[PDB]
Coordinates of C-alpha atoms in Angstrom, one line a residue:
Chain A
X1 CA 142.2 51.3 -10.8
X2 CA 138.6 50.7 -10.0
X3 CA 136.0 51.5 -7.3
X4 CA 135.6 49.1 -4.3
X5 CA 133.6 49.5 -1.2
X6 CA 136.5 49.2 1.2
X7 CA 137.0 49.3 5.0
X8 CA 139.7 50.6 7.3
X9 CA 142.2 48.0 8.5
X10 CA 140.4 46.3 11.5
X11 CA 143.8 45.7 12.9
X12 CA 143.6 48.3 15.7
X13 CA 140.0 47.5 16.7
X14 CA 140.8 43.8 17.1
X15 CA 143.3 44.7 19.9
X16 CA 140.3 46.0 21.7
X17 CA 137.8 43.1 21.4
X18 CA 137.1 40.9 24.5
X19 CA 134.4 38.5 25.7
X20 CA 131.9 39.7 28.3
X21 CA 129.8 36.8 29.7
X22 CA 127.0 37.4 32.2
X23 CA 124.7 34.7 33.5
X24 CA 123.7 32.6 30.5
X25 CA 124.4 35.6 28.2
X26 CA 127.6 36.2 26.3
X27 CA 128.2 39.0 23.9
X28 CA 131.1 41.4 23.1
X29 CA 132.8 44.3 24.7
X30 CA 135.3 47.0 23.7
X31 CA 138.4 47.1 26.0
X32 CA 139.9 50.6 26.1
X33 CA 142.4 51.5 28.8
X34 CA 141.3 50.2 32.2
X35 CA 137.7 50.3 31.0
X36 CA 135.5 47.8 29.2
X37 CA 132.3 48.7 27.3
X38 CA 129.5 46.3 26.4
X39 CA 125.7 46.6 25.7
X40 CA 123.9 46.6 29.1
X41 CA 121.3 44.0 28.1
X42 CA 124.1 41.5 28.7
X43 CA 122.8 41.4 32.3
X44 CA 119.4 40.3 31.1
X45 CA 117.5 37.1 30.2
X46 CA 114.8 36.7 27.6
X47 CA 112.2 37.4 30.3
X48 CA 113.8 40.5 31.7
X49 CA 113.6 42.0 28.2
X50 CA 109.8 42.4 28.3
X51 CA 110.0 45.2 30.9
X52 CA 113.7 45.6 31.9
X53 CA 114.7 47.8 34.8
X54 CA 118.4 47.9 34.2
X55 CA 119.0 50.1 37.2
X56 CA 117.5 47.7 39.7
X57 CA 118.7 44.7 37.7
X58 CA 122.3 45.9 37.5
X59 CA 122.1 46.4 41.3
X60 CA 121.7 42.6 41.7
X61 CA 125.2 42.2 40.1
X62 CA 128.7 42.8 41.4
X63 CA 132.1 43.1 39.9
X64 CA 132.6 39.4 39.4
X65 CA 129.1 38.8 38.1
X66 CA 130.7 39.6 34.7
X67 CA 133.2 37.2 33.4
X68 CA 135.5 39.0 30.9
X69 CA 138.3 37.3 29.1
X70 CA 140.9 38.8 26.7
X71 CA 141.5 35.8 24.6
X72 CA 142.0 32.9 27.0
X73 CA 143.1 34.9 30.1
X74 CA 140.2 36.5 32.0
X75 CA 140.3 40.1 33.3
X76 CA 139.4 41.3 36.8
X77 CA 136.4 43.5 37.1
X78 CA 137.2 46.3 39.6
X79 CA 133.8 48.0 39.6
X80 CA 130.7 48.2 37.4
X81 CA 128.5 51.2 36.5
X82 CA 125.8 52.2 34.0
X83 CA 125.7 54.8 31.2
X84 CA 122.6 54.8 29.2
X85 CA 122.5 51.7 27.1
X86 CA 126.0 50.6 27.7
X87 CA 127.9 49.3 30.8
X88 CA 131.2 50.7 31.9
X89 CA 133.2 48.0 33.7
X90 CA 136.6 48.8 35.3
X91 CA 139.6 46.5 35.2
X92 CA 142.9 45.7 36.9
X93 CA 144.9 46.1 33.7
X94 CA 144.3 48.9 31.2
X95 CA 144.5 47.6 27.6
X96 CA 148.1 47.6 26.5
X97 CA 146.9 47.6 23.0
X98 CA 144.7 50.6 23.4
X99 CA 145.3 53.0 20.4
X100 CA 144.6 56.7 19.8
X101 CA 140.8 56.8 19.8
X102 CA 137.8 59.0 20.3
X103 CA 134.0 58.6 20.4
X104 CA 131.9 60.3 17.7
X105 CA 128.3 60.3 16.6
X106 CA 128.0 59.7 12.9
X107 CA 125.1 61.2 11.0
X108 CA 122.9 59.7 8.3
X109 CA 124.6 59.3 5.0
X110 CA 128.1 58.9 6.6
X111 CA 129.8 55.5 6.4
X112 CA 132.0 53.4 8.5
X113 CA 133.8 50.0 9.0
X114 CA 132.2 47.3 11.1
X115 CA 134.3 44.5 12.7
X116 CA 131.8 41.8 13.5
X117 CA 132.9 39.6 16.4
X118 CA 131.6 36.5 18.3
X119 CA 132.5 35.4 21.8
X120 CA 135.2 38.1 21.8
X121 CA 136.7 37.1 18.5
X122 CA 136.6 38.6 14.9
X123 CA 134.7 36.9 12.1
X124 CA 135.0 39.5 9.4
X125 CA 134.9 43.2 8.4
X126 CA 132.6 45.1 6.1
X127 CA 131.6 48.7 5.3
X128 CA 128.1 50.2 5.5
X129 CA 126.2 53.5 6.1
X130 CA 124.0 54.9 8.7
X131 CA 120.8 55.0 6.6
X132 CA 118.5 58.1 6.8
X133 CA 116.0 56.2 8.9
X134 CA 118.8 55.7 11.6
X135 CA 119.2 52.0 10.9
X136 CA 122.1 49.9 9.6
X137 CA 122.1 47.2 7.1
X138 CA 125.0 45.3 8.6
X139 CA 125.3 41.5 9.0
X140 CA 124.8 40.4 12.6
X141 CA 123.9 37.2 14.5
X142 CA 123.4 36.3 18.1
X143 CA 126.6 37.1 20.0
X144 CA 127.1 39.9 17.6
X145 CA 125.9 42.7 19.9
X146 CA 128.9 44.5 21.4
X147 CA 130.6 44.8 18.1
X148 CA 131.8 48.3 17.1
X149 CA 131.7 50.5 14.0
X150 CA 134.5 52.9 13.2
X151 CA 136.6 55.1 10.9
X152 CA 140.4 55.6 11.2
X153 CA 141.8 59.1 10.7
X154 CA 145.6 58.9 10.7
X155 CA 146.3 56.2 13.3
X156 CA 143.2 57.2 15.2
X157 CA 140.2 55.0 15.8
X158 CA 137.0 57.1 15.9
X159 CA 134.5 54.7 17.3
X160 CA 130.9 55.7 16.3
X161 CA 128.7 52.6 16.6
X162 CA 128.2 49.5 18.8
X163 CA 125.8 46.8 17.8
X164 CA 122.8 45.8 19.9
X165 CA 119.7 44.3 18.2
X166 CA 118.1 43.5 14.9
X167 CA 114.8 44.9 13.6
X168 CA 111.8 43.1 12.0
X169 CA 113.1 43.7 8.5
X170 CA 116.6 42.3 9.0
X171 CA 118.2 45.7 9.5
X172 CA 120.2 46.8 12.6
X173 CA 120.0 49.3 15.3
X174 CA 122.7 50.3 17.8
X175 CA 124.2 53.1 19.8
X176 CA 127.1 55.6 19.8
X177 CA 129.8 54.7 22.3
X178 CA 128.4 57.1 24.8
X179 CA 125.5 54.7 25.1
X180 CA 122.6 56.5 23.3
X181 CA 120.8 54.7 20.4
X182 CA 120.8 56.0 16.8
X183 CA 117.0 56.3 16.7
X184 CA 113.7 56.0 18.6
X185 CA 114.8 52.5 19.5
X186 CA 114.6 51.3 23.1
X187 CA 116.6 48.2 24.1
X188 CA 113.7 46.3 25.5
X189 CA 111.4 43.7 24.0
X190 CA 108.5 45.8 22.7
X191 CA 106.9 46.3 19.3
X192 CA 109.3 48.3 17.2
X193 CA 110.0 48.7 13.5
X194 CA 112.3 50.8 11.3
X195 CA 110.7 53.9 9.9
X196 CA 110.5 54.1 6.1
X197 CA 114.1 54.6 5.0
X198 CA 114.7 56.9 2.0
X199 CA 118.0 57.5 0.1
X200 CA 121.1 59.5 0.6
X201 CA 121.3 62.2 -2.1
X202 CA 124.9 63.3 -1.4
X203 CA 126.1 59.7 -1.9
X204 CA 123.9 59.0 -4.8
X205 CA 125.7 62.0 -6.4
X206 CA 129.2 60.9 -5.3
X207 CA 128.3 57.7 -7.1
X208 CA 127.2 59.7 -10.1
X209 CA 130.6 61.4 -10.3
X210 CA 132.5 58.1 -9.8
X211 CA 130.5 57.0 -12.8
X212 CA 131.3 60.0 -15.1
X213 CA 134.9 59.8 -13.8
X214 CA 135.1 56.2 -14.9
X215 CA 132.9 56.8 -17.9
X216 CA 129.4 57.5 -19.2
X217 CA 127.6 60.9 -19.1
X218 CA 124.5 59.9 -21.1
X219 CA 122.7 61.1 -18.0
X220 CA 124.2 64.5 -18.5
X221 CA 122.6 67.6 -20.2
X222 CA 122.8 71.3 -20.5
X223 CA 119.9 71.0 -17.9
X224 CA 120.6 73.5 -15.1
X225 CA 118.4 73.4 -12.0
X226 CA 118.1 75.7 -9.0
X227 CA 118.8 74.7 -5.4
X228 CA 115.1 74.6 -4.9
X229 CA 114.0 73.0 -8.1
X230 CA 115.7 69.8 -7.3
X231 CA 114.7 69.7 -3.6
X232 CA 111.0 69.8 -4.6
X233 CA 111.6 66.8 -6.8
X234 CA 113.4 65.5 -3.6
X235 CA 110.7 64.9 -1.0
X236 CA 108.5 63.5 -3.8
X237 CA 111.1 60.8 -4.3
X238 CA 113.0 59.1 -1.5
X239 CA 116.1 61.3 -1.9
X240 CA 116.6 63.7 0.9
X241 CA 117.4 67.5 0.9
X242 CA 120.5 68.7 -0.8
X243 CA 121.5 71.3 1.8
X244 CA 124.0 74.0 1.1
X245 CA 126.6 72.0 3.0
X246 CA 126.3 69.1 0.6
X247 CA 126.8 71.6 -2.3
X248 CA 130.1 72.7 -0.7
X249 CA 131.2 69.0 0.0
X250 CA 130.4 68.0 -3.6
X251 CA 132.6 70.9 -4.4
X252 CA 135.9 69.0 -4.9
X253 CA 134.4 66.4 -7.2
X254 CA 132.7 69.3 -8.9
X255 CA 135.8 71.2 -9.7
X256 CA 137.5 68.0 -10.9
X257 CA 135.1 66.7 -13.4
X258 CA 134.4 70.2 -14.6
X259 CA 130.7 69.6 -13.9
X260 CA 128.6 71.8 -11.6
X261 CA 126.6 70.4 -8.7
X262 CA 123.5 72.1 -10.0
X263 CA 123.9 70.5 -13.5
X264 CA 124.6 67.2 -11.8
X265 CA 121.4 67.3 -9.7
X266 CA 119.6 68.3 -12.9
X267 CA 121.0 65.2 -14.5
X268 CA 119.4 63.3 -11.6
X269 CA 115.8 64.6 -12.0
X270 CA 116.0 62.9 -15.4
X271 CA 116.8 59.6 -13.7
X272 CA 113.6 60.0 -11.8
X273 CA 112.1 59.9 -15.3
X274 CA 113.5 56.4 -16.1
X275 CA 117.3 55.8 -16.1
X276 CA 116.7 52.2 -17.1
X277 CA 119.3 49.9 -18.8
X278 CA 120.4 50.7 -22.3
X279 CA 123.7 51.7 -20.7
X280 CA 123.0 51.6 -16.9
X281 CA 125.5 53.1 -14.5
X282 CA 128.4 51.0 -13.5
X283 CA 126.1 48.0 -13.9
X284 CA 123.8 48.8 -11.0
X285 CA 120.3 49.1 -12.4
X286 CA 119.5 51.4 -9.5
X287 CA 121.6 54.0 -7.7
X288 CA 124.2 53.5 -5.0
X289 CA 123.4 55.5 -1.9
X290 CA 126.1 54.2 0.4
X291 CA 129.2 55.5 -1.4
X292 CA 130.1 58.8 0.1
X293 CA 131.8 61.7 -1.8
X294 CA 134.9 61.4 0.4
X295 CA 135.0 57.7 -0.6
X296 CA 134.9 58.4 -4.4
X297 CA 137.4 61.3 -3.9
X298 CA 139.6 58.9 -1.9
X299 CA 139.6 56.0 -4.4
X300 CA 140.6 57.0 -8.0
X301 CA 142.7 60.1 -7.2
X302 CA 142.2 62.5 -10.1
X303 CA 143.5 66.0 -10.6
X304 CA 141.9 69.4 -11.1
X305 CA 143.0 71.7 -13.9
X306 CA 142.8 75.4 -13.0
Chain B
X1 CA 121.0 38.6 9.5
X2 CA 122.1 40.5 6.4
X3 CA 124.6 39.5 3.8
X4 CA 127.4 42.0 3.2
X5 CA 130.6 41.5 1.1
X6 CA 132.9 40.4 4.0
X7 CA 136.6 40.6 4.4
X8 CA 139.0 38.8 6.8
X9 CA 140.3 40.5 9.9
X10 CA 143.5 42.2 8.8
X11 CA 145.4 42.2 12.2
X12 CA 147.6 39.3 11.6
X13 CA 148.6 40.8 8.3
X14 CA 148.9 44.5 9.0
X15 CA 151.5 43.8 11.6
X16 CA 153.5 42.4 8.7
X17 CA 153.4 45.3 6.3
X18 CA 156.5 47.4 6.1
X19 CA 158.0 49.8 3.6
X20 CA 160.7 48.9 1.2
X21 CA 162.3 51.9 -0.5
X22 CA 165.0 51.5 -3.1
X23 CA 166.5 54.6 -4.7
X24 CA 163.4 56.8 -5.4
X25 CA 160.9 54.0 -5.9
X26 CA 159.1 52.7 -2.8
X27 CA 156.8 49.7 -2.2
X28 CA 155.2 47.7 0.5
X29 CA 156.8 44.4 1.6
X30 CA 155.7 41.3 3.5
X31 CA 157.5 40.7 6.8
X32 CA 157.5 37.2 8.2
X33 CA 160.0 36.0 10.7
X34 CA 163.4 37.2 9.3
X35 CA 162.6 37.1 5.5
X36 CA 161.0 40.1 3.7
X37 CA 158.9 39.9 0.5
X38 CA 158.3 42.5 -2.2
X39 CA 157.9 43.3 -5.9
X40 CA 161.1 42.6 -7.9
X41 CA 160.5 45.8 -9.9
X42 CA 161.5 47.8 -6.8
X43 CA 165.0 48.3 -8.2
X44 CA 163.8 50.0 -11.4
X45 CA 163.8 53.8 -12.0
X46 CA 161.6 55.4 -14.6
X47 CA 161.2 53.5 -17.9
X48 CA 163.1 50.6 -16.3
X49 CA 160.0 48.5 -16.2
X50 CA 160.1 49.1 -20.0
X51 CA 163.4 47.3 -20.3
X52 CA 163.6 44.8 -17.4
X53 CA 166.5 42.5 -17.4
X54 CA 166.2 42.3 -13.7
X55 CA 168.6 39.4 -13.0
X56 CA 171.3 41.9 -14.3
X57 CA 169.5 45.1 -13.2
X58 CA 169.9 43.9 -9.6
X59 CA 173.5 42.9 -9.7
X60 CA 174.7 46.4 -9.5
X61 CA 172.3 47.2 -6.7
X62 CA 173.5 46.4 -3.1
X63 CA 171.9 45.6 0.2
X64 CA 172.3 49.1 1.6
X65 CA 170.3 50.4 -1.4
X66 CA 167.3 48.8 0.3
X67 CA 165.5 50.9 3.0
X68 CA 163.3 48.3 4.7
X69 CA 161.2 50.2 7.2
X70 CA 158.7 49.2 9.9
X71 CA 157.2 52.7 10.5
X72 CA 160.4 54.0 12.0
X73 CA 162.9 51.2 12.9
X74 CA 165.2 50.3 10.0
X75 CA 165.5 46.6 9.3
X76 CA 169.1 45.6 8.6
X77 CA 168.9 43.9 5.3
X78 CA 171.1 41.0 4.1
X79 CA 169.9 38.8 1.3
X80 CA 169.7 40.4 -2.2
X81 CA 168.4 36.9 -3.2
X82 CA 165.8 37.2 -6.0
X83 CA 163.2 34.5 -6.2
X84 CA 160.9 34.4 -9.3
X85 CA 159.1 37.7 -9.6
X86 CA 159.9 38.6 -6.0
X87 CA 162.8 39.5 -3.8
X88 CA 163.7 37.7 -0.6
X89 CA 165.9 40.2 1.2
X90 CA 166.3 38.7 4.7
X91 CA 166.7 41.1 7.6
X92 CA 168.5 40.9 11.0
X93 CA 165.6 40.3 13.5
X94 CA 162.6 38.1 12.8
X95 CA 159.2 39.8 12.9
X96 CA 158.0 39.5 16.5
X97 CA 154.5 40.1 15.2
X98 CA 154.8 37.2 12.8
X99 CA 151.5 35.1 12.6
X100 CA 151.1 31.4 11.9
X101 CA 151.1 31.1 8.1
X102 CA 151.0 29.1 4.9
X103 CA 151.7 30.2 1.3
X104 CA 149.1 28.1 -0.5
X105 CA 148.1 29.3 -4.0
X106 CA 144.6 29.9 -5.2
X107 CA 142.7 28.7 -8.3
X108 CA 140.1 30.4 -10.5
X109 CA 136.9 31.4 -8.7
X110 CA 138.4 31.2 -5.3
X111 CA 138.2 34.3 -3.1
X112 CA 140.5 36.2 -0.7
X113 CA 140.8 39.5 1.2
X114 CA 143.2 42.3 0.2
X115 CA 145.1 44.8 2.5
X116 CA 145.8 47.7 0.2
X117 CA 148.8 49.5 1.6
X118 CA 151.0 52.5 0.6
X119 CA 154.4 53.4 1.9
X120 CA 154.2 50.2 4.0
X121 CA 151.1 51.5 5.8
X122 CA 147.7 49.7 5.5
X123 CA 145.2 52.0 3.8
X124 CA 142.1 49.8 3.5
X125 CA 141.1 46.2 3.3
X126 CA 138.6 44.6 0.9
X127 CA 137.4 41.3 -0.7
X128 CA 137.8 40.2 -4.3
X129 CA 137.8 37.0 -6.2
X130 CA 140.4 35.6 -8.6
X131 CA 138.7 36.2 -11.9
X132 CA 138.8 33.5 -14.6
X133 CA 140.6 35.8 -17.0
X134 CA 143.2 35.5 -14.3
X135 CA 143.0 39.0 -12.9
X136 CA 141.7 40.8 -9.8
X137 CA 139.2 43.5 -10.5
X138 CA 139.9 45.9 -7.6
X139 CA 141.4 49.1 -6.5
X140 CA 145.1 50.2 -6.3
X141 CA 146.3 53.7 -6.7
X142 CA 150.0 54.2 -7.3
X143 CA 152.4 52.7 -4.7
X144 CA 150.1 49.7 -4.2
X145 CA 152.6 47.2 -5.5
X146 CA 153.6 44.8 -2.8
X147 CA 150.1 44.7 -1.4
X148 CA 148.8 41.3 -0.2
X149 CA 145.8 38.9 -0.5
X150 CA 145.1 36.2 2.1
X151 CA 142.6 33.9 3.7
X152 CA 142.2 32.8 7.3
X153 CA 141.6 29.2 8.4
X154 CA 141.5 29.1 12.2
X155 CA 144.8 30.3 13.6
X156 CA 146.6 30.2 10.2
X157 CA 146.9 33.1 7.8
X158 CA 147.6 31.6 4.4
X159 CA 148.9 34.2 1.9
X160 CA 148.0 33.8 -1.7
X161 CA 148.5 37.1 -3.6
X162 CA 151.2 39.8 -4.0
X163 CA 150.0 42.9 -6.0
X164 CA 152.2 44.0 -8.9
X165 CA 151.0 45.6 -12.0
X166 CA 147.7 47.2 -13.3
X167 CA 146.3 46.4 -16.7
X168 CA 145.3 49.1 -19.2
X169 CA 141.7 48.0 -18.8
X170 CA 141.8 49.0 -15.1
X171 CA 142.0 45.5 -13.6
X172 CA 145.3 44.4 -12.1
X173 CA 147.6 41.4 -11.7
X174 CA 150.2 39.9 -9.4
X175 CA 151.7 36.7 -8.1
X176 CA 151.5 34.0 -5.5
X177 CA 154.0 34.3 -2.6
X178 CA 156.4 32.1 -4.5
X179 CA 156.8 34.5 -7.3
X180 CA 154.7 32.6 -9.8
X181 CA 152.5 35.1 -11.6
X182 CA 148.8 34.4 -12.0
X183 CA 147.6 33.7 -15.5
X184 CA 150.0 34.4 -18.5
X185 CA 151.0 37.9 -17.2
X186 CA 154.5 39.3 -16.7
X187 CA 156.0 42.5 -15.3
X188 CA 157.4 44.9 -17.9
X189 CA 155.7 47.2 -20.4
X190 CA 155.1 44.5 -23.0
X191 CA 151.6 46.2 -23.3
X192 CA 149.8 43.0 -22.4
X193 CA 146.0 42.8 -21.9
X194 CA 143.7 40.4 -20.1
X195 CA 141.5 37.8 -21.9
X196 CA 137.7 37.5 -21.8
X197 CA 136.1 36.4 -18.5
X198 CA 133.3 34.1 -17.6
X199 CA 131.3 33.8 -14.4
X200 CA 132.6 31.5 -11.6
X201 CA 129.0 30.5 -11.5
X202 CA 129.6 28.3 -8.4
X203 CA 129.8 31.7 -6.6
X204 CA 126.7 33.3 -8.2
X205 CA 125.0 30.1 -7.3
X206 CA 126.2 29.8 -3.7
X207 CA 125.2 33.4 -3.4
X208 CA 121.6 32.4 -3.7
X209 CA 122.0 30.0 -0.8
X210 CA 122.6 32.9 1.6
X211 CA 119.8 34.8 -0.1
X212 CA 117.5 32.1 1.0
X213 CA 118.7 31.9 4.6
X214 CA 118.0 35.6 4.9
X215 CA 114.4 34.9 3.8
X216 CA 114.5 37.0 0.6
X217 CA 113.3 34.3 -1.7
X218 CA 111.4 34.5 -5.1
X219 CA 113.2 32.2 -7.5
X220 CA 113.5 28.9 -5.5
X221 CA 110.9 27.5 -7.9
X222 CA 111.2 26.9 -11.7
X223 CA 111.2 24.2 -14.3
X224 CA 113.5 22.0 -12.4
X225 CA 116.3 21.9 -15.0
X226 CA 118.8 19.3 -16.0
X227 CA 122.6 19.0 -15.4
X228 CA 123.5 19.9 -19.0
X229 CA 120.7 22.0 -20.4
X230 CA 121.6 24.5 -17.7
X231 CA 125.3 25.1 -18.1
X232 CA 124.4 25.1 -21.8
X233 CA 122.5 28.3 -21.5
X234 CA 125.3 29.5 -19.2
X235 CA 127.5 29.8 -22.3
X236 CA 124.5 31.7 -23.6
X237 CA 125.1 34.3 -20.9
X238 CA 128.9 33.9 -20.3
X239 CA 128.9 31.4 -17.4
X240 CA 131.6 28.7 -17.3
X241 CA 130.1 25.2 -16.9
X242 CA 130.0 23.2 -13.7
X243 CA 130.9 19.7 -12.6
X244 CA 129.6 17.5 -9.8
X245 CA 133.0 18.0 -8.2
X246 CA 131.5 21.5 -7.8
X247 CA 128.1 20.5 -6.4
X248 CA 129.4 17.8 -4.0
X249 CA 130.9 20.7 -2.0
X250 CA 127.4 22.3 -2.1
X251 CA 126.5 19.3 0.1
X252 CA 126.2 21.3 3.3
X253 CA 124.7 24.2 1.3
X254 CA 121.5 22.2 0.4
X255 CA 121.9 20.2 3.6
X256 CA 121.0 23.5 5.3
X257 CA 117.7 24.2 3.6
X258 CA 116.4 21.3 1.5
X259 CA 116.5 23.4 -1.7
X260 CA 117.7 21.4 -4.7
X261 CA 120.7 22.2 -6.8
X262 CA 119.1 21.7 -10.2
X263 CA 115.9 23.6 -9.4
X264 CA 118.0 26.4 -8.0
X265 CA 119.9 26.4 -11.3
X266 CA 116.6 26.9 -13.1
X267 CA 116.1 30.1 -11.2
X268 CA 119.1 31.5 -13.1
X269 CA 117.7 30.6 -16.5
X270 CA 114.6 32.6 -15.6
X271 CA 116.9 35.1 -14.1
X272 CA 118.7 36.1 -17.3
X273 CA 116.5 35.1 -20.3
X274 CA 113.8 36.8 -18.4
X275 CA 115.6 38.6 -15.6
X276 CA 114.3 40.0 -12.4
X277 CA 113.4 43.5 -13.6
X278 CA 112.1 45.0 -10.4
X279 CA 112.6 42.9 -7.3
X280 CA 116.2 42.2 -6.3
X281 CA 118.4 39.8 -4.4
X282 CA 119.8 41.1 -1.2
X283 CA 120.0 44.6 -2.8
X284 CA 122.3 44.2 -5.9
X285 CA 120.7 44.2 -9.3
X286 CA 123.5 42.3 -11.0
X287 CA 124.3 38.7 -10.0
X288 CA 127.2 38.5 -7.6
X289 CA 130.0 36.0 -8.4
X290 CA 132.5 37.0 -5.7
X291 CA 131.0 34.7 -3.0
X292 CA 132.3 31.1 -2.7
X293 CA 130.2 28.4 -0.9
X294 CA 132.6 28.7 2.1
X295 CA 132.4 32.4 2.2
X296 CA 128.6 32.1 2.4
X297 CA 128.7 29.5 5.1
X298 CA 131.7 31.2 6.8
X299 CA 129.4 34.3 7.1
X300 CA 126.0 32.8 7.8
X301 CA 127.5 30.5 10.4
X302 CA 129.6 33.0 12.4
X303 CA 133.0 31.3 12.3
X304 CA 135.4 33.5 14.3
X305 CA 139.2 33.0 14.5
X306 CA 142.2 33.5 16.7

């Protein structure tokens, strides 16, 4: 019984992947019901990207200007239309494998499963988090745009992200399924760059509990800090604000390990004092920011004595 | 353009997981064509796994006392045929969802993906490597027995692990899909423990290769070491030796850069006797060993499936 950075079974999402090829551009598209979603820049060429006018461009393209194929059999496009940075294509046969779904907009800190695909087929699946700077540290290559990110709540695929491009530092930016980017990022070829990404406090703590849970509290002390004595030390360091909503959330882990969020945060200010080796924390010389409370709670189901 | 810990798409395997209740106990089974696979110890109640005669403990049990379930439909069982550490209770209809499969068996250092299930329902999927001490450091709460580990090689899911027991140390153990346990483990309460482990090395090595491809390089240089002096120090840091039968596979690896094998090896010497204190490799502080040369190419290359 150990911690693992897991992902939801990509099974359901795969039954929604297809290949959308336009011109000399081929990427991916999510096929839900009689609709097929793909990043709109599919209808562009390296040149168009310098100053794309998607509205006018898309106009120069009809229903069978987009060759979509579910596996080896191609689908019939019965109408095209634009929605922000996506492209809603209609089809003659709604997806018979469409599962209970829904579109959400994840926030920074939150995690999700990404099913990378190429030419409409799956390569692998991995987990990751929507960093505080609105970027993602996924693993994408050309032909990867069009891939989705999700979370499955009891037989329900909550789609939250759809890949597009890759930033200067090797990180990734994409949009929600409605078609709006997760940042100040525009899908055109202009000078852009990820803003200085910090660290997720809430998950750095979840990690901290997972640690205690599984052993080691050398980073613990009778040290008690206020809800404003930690947050000052916060902006100094990369770690973000520990709102009152994080407190509550850290509640369940709190009650379990018998430790108080305040005394936990206080244990952290002493890590921004060193926190070197000597005993480390589950190996990691640093601090894991992409393991959410829910995740730790999830894995390693412990009890709470009352 | 990043390098995450990837897992195989779990669609061709999820559609195989079913539930296999027997009395009060309940596991997850593998459903291929007509046959159904599952953990022998599914006929035991309470401290039965303390005193497992099995071959006799199954005699009294009958087909009916086997509730194979596919999420609703009951699968008429008919084949209380025990095979090694597994059962082989055939059912009436063959799994229509059955994929194209093999049952190959993995060796130390090799990797595979895991579809953790509970009550026959896929919970999460992840990737782990067959440790040398012959165990799989991973995550499995109760009711994880019956879970499965596989690999995908172009239109062919080859199964290679069936989760069974969990060691006291936290790590777990199971068997190939033939019943043959892995390492010298058994399934009772003989209070067995796992031996000392060494690093697959060939993975920690091949991990660097993908580090390079993603730019992140600051070790490619070093006192270009030998072929013996190196693995010598390995046993100075707990790393099993290496043979040319292990580098000749790294053919394409180097063939996709120009970076030597030996020189690369020297980066390690300087990586442990000195370390890296400060800068990191693709994020992690520790050196990752759960990444085979194929896993690294499989990712960096984009190899899809079907």
